[PDB]
Amino acid sequence: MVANPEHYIKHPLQNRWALWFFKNDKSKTWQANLRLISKFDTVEDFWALYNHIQLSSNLMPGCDYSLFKDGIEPMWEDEKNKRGGRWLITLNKQQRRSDLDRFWLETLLCLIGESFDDYSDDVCGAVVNVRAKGDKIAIWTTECENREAVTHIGRVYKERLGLPPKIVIGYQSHADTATKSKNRFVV
Numbered sequence: 001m002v003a004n005p006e007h008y009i010k011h012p013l014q015n016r017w018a019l020w021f022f023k024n025d026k027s028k029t030w031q032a033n034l035r036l037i038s039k040f041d042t043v044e045d046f047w048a049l050y051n052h053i054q055l056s057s058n059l060m061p062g063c064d065y066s067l068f069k070d071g072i073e074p075m076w077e078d079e080k081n082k083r084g085g086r087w088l089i090t091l092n093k094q095q096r097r098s099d100l101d102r103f104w105l106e107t108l109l110c111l112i113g114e115s116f117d118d119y120s121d122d123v124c125g126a127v128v129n130v131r132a133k134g135d136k137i138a139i140w141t142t143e144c145e146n147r148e149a150v151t152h153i154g155r156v157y158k159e160r161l162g163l164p165p166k167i168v169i170g171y172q173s174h175a176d177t178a179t180k181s182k183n184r185f186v187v
């Protein structure tokens, strides 16, 4: 009689997120090809978007999805990414059907669930690149000199995906990727 079961129509997330899509439309430049699909700030709206969008393993080669916090564009040029970098995970051709979709959904849940605790503010978003040569998934962070935040993020993320502990993943600064002719950290 006292303890009435309570329920909620919406369950807000701690941050608002935006899903971006990149298509290699050869009539446009790189930046013009990076477009905002939609924003969400609740569990219900995340699942409504995820269940009704094309899987990463079904995208054409050269396409990308990105989930970034509201106000952060998924590019090195953004103020919140300029001094940052990314933890990069590389997949071979065999892993497209077996790992890509599982890894990306686990990455999305990692982000929206704030799995990095006190280093949550260092997280900017994640990107999945679908490529014929090999797929890639990355988590983008705001400051490549914050070693404690970067390595905590990397360690929690690598363990979450269930990656074998013997093969390392690297963290590349965006300033180094933008000038490539090199990893700052490994985990």
Ligand SMILES: C[n+]1cn([C@@H]2O[C@H](COP(=O)(O)OP(=O)(O)O)[C@@H](O)[C@H]2O)c2nc(N)[nH]c(=O)c21
Pocket (backbone or CB within 6 Å): 030, 031, 074, 075, 076, 077, 129, 131
């Ligand atoms: C993420 N990123 C990708 N590029 C361009 O995309 C190219 C390839 O970057 P990629 O698509 O991340 O890797 P890929 O080698 O598997 O294709 C880079 O050499 C840049 O020309 C980018 N170009 C700009 N301006 N800004 C970015 O944030 C950015």
